[PDB]
Every structure is written in structure tokens, then in C-alpha cells.
Amino acid sequence: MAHHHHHHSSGLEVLFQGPRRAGTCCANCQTTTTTLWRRNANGDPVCNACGLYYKLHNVNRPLTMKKE
């Protein structure tokens, strides 16, 4: 029809691997405020950053502990 990559979620922009999981927690930073639940090596749910980052670098995203 008219499909296009309009990133309405400014700041959450990784379109590799997979989609999302709605109401989950991040296999790294336990954030639950995430609209883009990607998978890690185990197929474990990760928020935009930890999935975006691992996709670039094959590793989790140095950020916080595990719960901030």
C-alpha cells in the first residue's frame, strides 16, 4: 500500500533481527518501558538498546547494572 520506515519512536530505531514482545523485561537492564523487544544470543528478550547494541557488537550494552 504505502509502507515506509517512519521512525515515530525517536530514539528507538533498530530494525534488525526481530520485532517486539509488548509487556516484558530486558534480559540485561530489566527495563520494561520498551516497544521494541529484540532477542539476545539465547533468544532472550532485550529492550531496543540491548538488542540494538548486541546486533552491532555481539555483546550486551554497557549501560547500568541489571536493574539500573
Q: What residues make contact with Zn ion under the rule CB under 5 A?
A: 26, 28-29, 47, 50
Distances (CA, A) of 49 to 3, 15, 19, 52: 24, 12, 13, 5
The nearer residue to Zn ion, 1 or 65, going by C-beta atoms, is 65
* Cα gap 64→68, rounded to integer Å: 5
**Least distance (Å) between residue 52 CB and Zn ion:** 9
**Least distance (Å) between residue 59 CB and Zn ion:** 13
**Least distance (Å) between residue 37 CB and Zn ion:** 9
